[model samples]
Target: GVFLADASANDAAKKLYKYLRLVYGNKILSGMMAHVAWNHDEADKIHVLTGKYPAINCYDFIHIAVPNQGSNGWINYNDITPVTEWADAGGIVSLMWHFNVPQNENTTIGADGSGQGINSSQTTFKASHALVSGTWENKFFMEQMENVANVILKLQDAGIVALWRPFHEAAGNATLKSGANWGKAWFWWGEDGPDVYKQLWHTMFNYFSNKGIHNLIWEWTSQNYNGDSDIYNNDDDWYPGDAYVDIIGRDLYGTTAVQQYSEYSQLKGRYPSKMIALAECGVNNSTITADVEQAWNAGAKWLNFMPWYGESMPSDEWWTKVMNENVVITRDEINQ
Candidate 1:
């Protein structure tokens, strides 16, 4: 009964979308976002801790758009070998793009690739300029997307399907009325507010569609209310509409599963027809199993819960216990 936002999605993507929907309420999939793109260190760490690998291995293309991939610790998106291998082994591949741009779409960074503009504070990059024809921002944005499109085409050729979440957290801690709270609109994409954000989302959606990149299950990140009354009115103000997104993803930190349940309920209540996922979760004092079970008991059945890499990661004991849970699905279970 699930429909991909893109009607022309490839068979692999369609299949993955259907599978995710099938397991939505009954089982929660295990996931981990890889901190090291050049290697599978995060997933490797998880495998070492638990007997099984996560059902989903998430990767970020933070440095893909930048020119200096060779130096300054930047990763080359051209080499998606690790991603393809994961998909080939039947593990789910999820892709995210940090899409770093130059400051104000004009300032240049040194060879190190530091001080690139993705964070709002670091740069005054205007989201609206990307939409304007013949502008520097527009050209820069298009070039970046071209690079991403090529990588996605490579995956499509390999018959791989990925959960693509781009321009995530576009409404960081802000409502339609109040705008960004202090330094909350952390990303440049959200600095200009939701109108500009939605336009950018549509621009990417159209661009990818036109480029024939259909091996993507479009997932959009929705900010959590965090008990703030201002957040309630605009939980979905940045949403690009049903035709552009298949999944509603929310990033959460330092919260118990019981607390996660509250956010889950809020998202579900807002986007009832769409599948909801805990795209990122962690930075809590509790174990993964304990938190997951707490949410499950409380009726918050996230499609998957991917603990953030490093600082928010779960312990070895927590990984082992959570992977063994009857309600949880692992890489082996997914392939089977």
Candidate 2:
């Protein structure tokens, strides 16, 4: 009874979404995101530590968003050999964007250096311009999306089903009143406020669909709650509607799913039909196994748990233990 956010999703995406729905309650898939666009050693590190690869491998489109001929532009989006290799080897692919826009109205976007506005703090680019028809921002955004779609089409042709996560943490810690304050929000896509953010999400969804990029499982990362009830409302305000997203994701750090059970519960209760996942999670003093086990014991059945890429956090021993858990689904288990 699983349904993809995109009704026209291809067969591969449909199968993948069905599998995610099937394992939602009893089993949680192990997942990891690559540290950088050019390098995908996160899964390799996991394999070395646990003799098993994570079922999911996440990648970013930061480097590809800005076209350049310099060292900053290392990821040739067209060359998804690493992605295809992982998929062919029975691993699920997850993709996100850290799209770098212009630092200011006067600055031309490029990928020559870190100062080229990849982080929200570095960019003053108005996100609202994306909805405008003839602005430079709109033009640049369309071209960038077209490029990403072309790359994804390559994956679609290769039978790769990807968890496409975009415009994550759009609300950050800001209130709707923070409107248009680029410095207030965590990302440029969210600087203009929630209503604008919805339009932006719609922009991408419509554009991608129109371009026939249907092999994506749209996952939206919901903001962390701050104990106040208003925070919950804020998350709802930023959501791009259930019709546009397949999964409800939360990025957590320095905490376990057990400690954040309230978040998991609230999100699940709010979006009962959408599968909830620990889209990005890590801890400083605890093992990932402890995190998942505690939550599972407490009845927080997340679809997947993805610790972000790094050498530290879970440690080698904990990595092995988590992967060895009977409920933790790894690449080998998925292949079977």
Candidate 3:
């Protein structure tokens, strides 16, 4: 069955809970996924409460945020045993890798340094192989891969793994750190560009498969906006190809229904997969309802509209319209 979860703190969870309750009523509450905490302490509390109040089945999906140590840290995936156990008991476990890229490197770049400086946050600048390689930076990457592989392997062993990878609009921030237009950092394009991104994805797939981790369904997510362009020119460049992806998703906000739907249709034409989803979508009351309908018409099977806390929440009117719409899949109806 399909489940929904918000990977933020309490406030975000509260808003989504309200929307689900008002629109879906008690039906969805019993089967939906809600991320209660990043640590065991917070998770333990929810587990206890939910155990007592069985009516609040609204918690089904638990998205665990994997920690990425800077240039010198590592994650011990062995510690995630409790999470796997929870999922094995008829719950869904989603692993969210927030920032998968290295400090200053772009996964898309190649060895020749053609697509340098694609992703760069102010706190985190880009780096290239030209400046550093071998054990220091590369070791961290290897460790992360091993950690994730271990998690996937464990989940497979438990028979309860619903995986999502490299999520949340990565391509939109591709050029800030360094590139032909911005800063001249060596790792701007990171490894090369889309080519390397595909390579790394395949590498992950091979590694997982070799280790016999079979209970995974990969979700390839992208943000709503194209980098530095309103014309949608770079869509092809950012796509990691169908060979490496099992599901296609887009994260969009503040965009009109026509614009977003048009882009979605273009993508659908290229990939005729049934697992199309809006991994993250948010809009205010001022936003048109037609956008949602358009997305449905454009062939998005699973639409997850999460009006974030900082953003305006959909009003009663909006929820009413959504509930009345036939396209939405309620939790009870999802499994069937």
Candidate 4:
């Protein structure tokens, strides 16, 4: 769903539609989440204007970062109406509240400093004016949630599925307490320190569920760790309990086919019940083909390009190679 423009100004939309038709054909109607441009209102308008097709009926995914919280021009509660319109017209809306840092400002502390303590200022649960403790006693967070819920309710009222994604890529950004940049303050389970992050996640999930909102498909995403075995070993503590997660995905960039395959294998071995997906993958054309084969071979149930552009898009040559290889997975083969 990430927007892409063709070389000829021939409208990448048409090319994308054609590509989907040719690659997936009628099978495209299955549930999918397409990440599109949140700022360029025109991109969405264009999709609505010229991208219509019956074959697309197979698609049932949400848009990512549509109502971005970190954008310079933040979309207030009232601004979500247009996005709701898109969903009502037969699209799934996925929203992302990317950074929910507990700290007020960005600062770096030593790995063994007091900042590394459980209740230290560096903790992910530090008071944020945006959350209940900061600007409003969880008032800001609640209001934001309510606005998203209202939009989803509206979509449901109009017969559209809704997907909500908040606090995404929280583990990767080191600058944010919850990210790697801030050291160990905001880890998956806060294993290195206090268990506040997990508690917060549970609290939020409970808050949402208590409201009787059942249409949302929660997507828990993470970025690959930078270090070696020590980092990988520490991952277990960061995983939020499986009871609260429906899907598990990873955001990978500048990785090799071998590394991706290894990561996929590790994830599958760890979380077998939850549907595994390539939540966000960004690599070159050669890597894409290799990664796809490696993923399917490793038993991934779903594969998706992070965004159409950036490092995620597979080149024409890459696509052609995959098709020509005819690496088929047959019903009988899988059924056995």
Candidate 5:
């Protein structure tokens, strides 16, 4: 409660933050993750499918970098009214960042002029550190991150408490093999390894905290089975310590129903005090109600589950079963 009211957040942030934790303590809420598209408020995807908007809506940081121009995603710093308005409507908003490589010709080779292969310095990963705490040499990189923080501050001013997760899948490059972790890995922040990744996160945390933004509940998300994709399974190596985090989450997709249960246990076993969630999911053919039952039975007791957007939403029939299942919390139910 007090945390939401600290820094730049106020009564509205406190109110909603308190509400999520309160309802989450007793019953898990339902949510849907979204990727922003232009010319509309959240692409009309959530509405087209759920008919009932999710309890929470998600936006990525891709738009923050390419703001006001042609690129992917919304909630960019330049145009944030829609997301904030969604939050004001008794809904929750979440944020994730996918900080990208600089536009071009920047000498992107590792120390020995090789790609960031196994046992070699991932040049991109090391280069990113310079902006955070290393050199302050990359003014453009610094602004890309700082500009996004400014957006969070905007949300704070709007009295919106956002579930903010940045640099997701931080443990995605373990051992740097093919088709497993590094196969799906992007971003250089975590490529240097966990110690550096944790440092980068602290850099991010300090920058935001110093900016007087506290309407954020920092969520640390790792890809399931870690190491980027199916089977690396080492999520904890990049954790930024309990002091810097609030929720433990993971991104799960594909035919990994059993994998989801296994990874949830992995996170909960290590971070029992923090809230746990299927932060992003798009399972194949599994109903929302099915996930709810299996997760709780396995003691995931998740704060909520958010499948990916629009076409991927659980079928209306399945969602109906989910709503009728009596355990999943809906927007109307939790808003009160």
Candidate 6:
């Protein structure tokens, strides 16, 4: 699957995601979603090649001060436009969030919308209060979190079914190991550690449920072993729990892409009741992107394998060799 950007809204609304959903079984539907300029027009990677847009188009629910709406700049101001447009066009729309910390909690990017910046606020923020304890952070957190719920409400009002993957990359092989903390623990949500992270997940899930945003299929993912040489390899200590997650996936990169099958096997063993996917497979920086072809060929049977940005937009000859047939999937064969 591929990720789509807001700029592609017009492109996709035309005849893109419509064509991408045709393939299934032996073939996988192409997914499209790309990170572009914050709160502005952007391009979907499908523009890289000829043919149709993928079946899935993802957008992050990062806050960019949508005060024009009720979010008080606490919600995603821009993506909702294209998100609504893409979903209306029949493409698979997914939502992920950068997770802005409660107001004032993140002293660094507290009010600057730093949460929407480069790597998503996780790196720049950490929760000051423990989630398990009923500290002011609870009210602090829920206040901002309610904004996210309302954002989901906007999509629901439009009849969109979202593959909601939030709080992604919560744990993994990290550079730090402060006794109880196994991974980086840099993301604000995971700062209080796994149990807290688990509570946070349930909190959001229940929060969304109470808010009536039922059109979501909860997909939980975290860094597997990015093969980055250090950090982000094994934070199995922080998994939220199998029941709360509908689809369990891993974000693989660097040499980690080479272990797609192994990672798949591991995740399968861990969450046998849930669907498994290559939630995200980064290929741009390494030869491992090529490893994805092997993973698919060996019968990984991923619900979908959405690659990151430009490196993943498959080209003509590349499509025929690596994607066509049962290896990948084509709207021509299935969507027809």
Note the Cα lDDT for every prediction shown.
0.80, 0.78, 0.43, 0.41, 0.62, 0.56
Candidate 4, 43-127: lDDT as tens digits:
2422343342111111111222123333343333334454555544544344444322223233332222222222234344342
Model 5 per-residue lDDT tens digits across residues 80-137: 7767777657777777766654333364423222322222233333544455554433
TM-score of each: 0.92, 0.90, 0.59, 0.56, 0.77, 0.73
Q: Is candidate 1 or candidate 6 better by TM-score?
A: 1
Q: Model 1, stretches more than 4 Å misplaced?
A: 36-38, 68-74, 104-106, 176-184, 230-232, 284-290
* Model 1 C-alpha lDDT per residue in residues 172-201, reported as the tens digit of each score: 766534543563577878878788999999
Model 5: worst 10 consecutive residues (lDDT sum):
111-120
- What clash pairs does model 5 have? 172-228, 181-227, 225-233
Q: Kindly give the stretch of ten consecutive residues in candidate 3 with the minimal lDDT sum.
A: 52-61
Model 3 regions more than 4 Å off: 1-93, 100-119, 122-133, 173-192, 223-232, 284-325
Q: Pairs clashing in candidate 1?
A: none
Candidate 1 TM-score, true structure as reference: 0.92
- Give per-candidate clash totals: 0, 0, 25, 15, 3, 20
lDDT of 6 by residue, 47-138 (tens): 34435455566676565333443345444453567677665555567677766543344443444454332222333333545353576556
Poorest lDDT segment (10 consecutive residues) of candidate 1 = 175-184
CA shift of 127, model 5, Å: 4.3
RMSD of each: 2.5, 3.0, 10.9, 12.1, 6.1, 7.4
Instruction: Encode model 2's per-residue lDDT on 138-174: one tens digit a residue.
Output: 8778888887788888888888889999999887766
lDDT of 2 at 197: 92
RMSD (Cα, Å) of model 2: 3.0
